[PDB]
């Protein structure tokens, strides 16, 4: 951690608001973006796990203040019907969010604009995984900026600074 | 033959605007006949010249020069004879982003001085009862850079008015979009409506190429045998200003070589201080032009 | 029968425009009838034909012919009887990239000769008071090249005027975009408006292909018997010029042989200037007619 | 280096702008263009690092002196966090670059355009390398041309004099 | 060399032209169309050399003797710099052509309509060649046509002979 002072941060990291939401709504269910050693440890028997992996599409303009993502939503677990009924809630918990507000450990408080929809669910083949069923879904999510201000003066500075 | 010479596509001062920054100011402020200030060469604004803020990145600005005119024939002419112009009006919009105290001015047609903010930050933006036909001082400058000698273009207007609003959309895919169009008036004390003005240290390089005035061949250092003394007098330093065949100072760009630097230094500045008295020789070359001068140093 | 005979489809003559450098002058400049220089075969300008610059690339210029016509019918008949025709306007828009003086004085209508740069390079392009209609006369010339013999099209016009400025784009993805619309004016001391012209030493090949004059069926060298003097006299060397049936000359692209080098060596330049005092014999060919001459030369 | 003298450049080698202008900004944080052996050498640990590879797309005008390319940005760093705050910071120093100038070692200063966006971050999974963490980003980079004089003269007599 | 004396020829062959004008600018450096072995002998130090390589896209008419072709420019050189530099010559010397005339050895001289640009340069990743640097990028060449004459006369007298 040796980034300049006078920058504080520019995005929201979206997936992380995700991830720690869903943590926050049940405790009991773990969360993430990666694949824990310790989940990975049982597999005949696995605890719920949503997972969130950003994938490509979407433009992003500063002047506008807007940020878009087609983030994708992967749910593992031992059932068929548990996957199913697991995405259903994500689903509900996603679809209808029209300017919603939730705050993270940091300390600000993210603005999610509109989460769409882009594939369904996909029912993927058991493959390297066997017991575990995943179903697969995308979604086109916007979320705002946290601080839009420019930095052209600073690294102007240290321009001028280094050359002139 | 060489039609490439006769064709002359320099492609070299086809300069494109970057950053097109609309100031406002009001009635009030005198309009400026210039861009630059005549004192060091780099950009100086009139008090009162207020950026309206940021425009459209994808679209950008869409100036248009609408021209009207009438044909004459009653004699049966087979092609219209004096065929005369009437309307040359002049009509640009740009959209904006940011919602302050200008932009708000602006496409409200109002004076929000006398209001005030609550306690709490309460405000509120009124229409006008009336509504005034309010005018303002536009000015389009662009931006191009050229090595260290950047291009300054302007579309200088001392009268706009608002001309038409479009209709904004504030759905949930963009901000608002403020894009009103406004119609180029023309202004009486100063007699001109609008009007393209270029500036800016590096277009002195290529105003020669493009055709204005004449061709740079000759130059002068105007001080032909400047005296500086030794000690911190009152004519101790001296400044240079060479002078071409054009009319046009090259005194920022042109560096000058001292010859003997235990005699008088100058540097890029043209600084003539003096180190010992004598005479020295100093040249000054931008990247074609030879000029030689002699300074006298004495105590 | 042979139909690709009757349906003539050469496919060999359609010149397709290259470079379409438009030349400007102001109304001052007497027009000139011809493109191409009666005195070698290459292409001369007078003085004050000045070109735009560059042009649009992926566009391109659009040049159009509007005709208007008018019936006439009062006794009861099915089909217009004399359809006369009233205006042939032709107009033309190009793009511009470089701003230099003749652009300038197109766009804005002025005469930019008394404005002279400032001292740092400010200056101002100012809009008429009063719009002048300054007519320019304007060359469009085009190139077609095959081997060493190009081909030269031209669209020549006696005078010219501004039509109509459509909108112009300046945003972030472009450099700034002038593309007038100008409409051909009827000149009344040559009497002529819009004249198409083709030159240049490529088209005499195929002149008689496009069915202008006659077919090339006969050729002749105009020197009977010259007389060149073995010493560097007045008459030491000898212009040679074969004239065909059609009445133009063949000397630049016909190649001359000589049969007796030790009399007299001719080169394709058709020098004649003589080694021994004798007579020889000068083949000319070019890629099917044979002509024969007879050059005596003597001391 | 034997390239004629009457020819100098053509264009400004936008990413040499990039990497060096990076490295100027934060000296203590390599970037580059390549895979130097030293960062090579250690994996667990790693120095984090800028790339910057070219990739196609985007016309290009002599006549309007611009261009552009469709250069992408991948930070490569030992922890998630790490490479998502360096990318955000990428972004924040990119995405509001609207006609800014910076100068290199050569001698002349470069004028960037418009930094565009195509692809959002990319998450690759670890391949050949398993504990660094890599992100993948596509900007639209536009930037100006040095000189635009043609060249047509030059070679013209070139020609007349080899053949004629 | 057995083709009808009726039939010279119908193309230019614009490579052709394309490496001949290239190899008369700098003799010194070699350039052409297929790979020598004389310079695959030597690859830690390698001639810099530009390859042309004629690709699909562009319509022809005969009508208006006009062709064109997605030929590519790609340059192999031992250094990265070095192969930078030479693509920027090289599309200095490519994209500002706009009617402009070479002439071959064999005797016509080719008319050069335009030559656009529709990928940038690609540094493709070292492969079987490691040490040299090669850059990748496709040009729109437009280039004229020699003769345009139409052959049906003596296909039409050759199958009136054969067959009547």
Known sequence: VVLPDWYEEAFVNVENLFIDMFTDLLPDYESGCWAPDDWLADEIEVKPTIWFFRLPGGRVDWDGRKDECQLQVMVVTG???????????????????????????????????????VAGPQLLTPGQRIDTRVVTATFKVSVSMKSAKNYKQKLYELWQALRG | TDFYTIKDAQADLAIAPLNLTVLLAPYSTTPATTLESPTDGSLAIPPGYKSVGHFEKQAGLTLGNEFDSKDIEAYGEPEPIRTIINKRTTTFDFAMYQNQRNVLELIWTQDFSNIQP????????????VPKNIYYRAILVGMDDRNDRPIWLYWLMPKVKLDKLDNQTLNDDNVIEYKPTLKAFRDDVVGYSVAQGFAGPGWRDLVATAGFGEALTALTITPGSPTVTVATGASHTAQLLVEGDNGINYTPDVVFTSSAPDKASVSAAGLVTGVAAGSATITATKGALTATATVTVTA
Do not use: N
């Open chain 1, 79 to 117: 059932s068929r019907d548990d996957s199913w009924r697991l995405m259903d809630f994500v689903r509900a918990m996603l679809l209808p969010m029209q300017g919603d507000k939730y705050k993270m450990a940091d300390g600000y408080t993210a603005q999610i604009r509109c989460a769409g929809e």
């Open chain 2, 118 to 129: 609550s306690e709490f930050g309460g405000i509120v933006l009124e229409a006008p009862k």
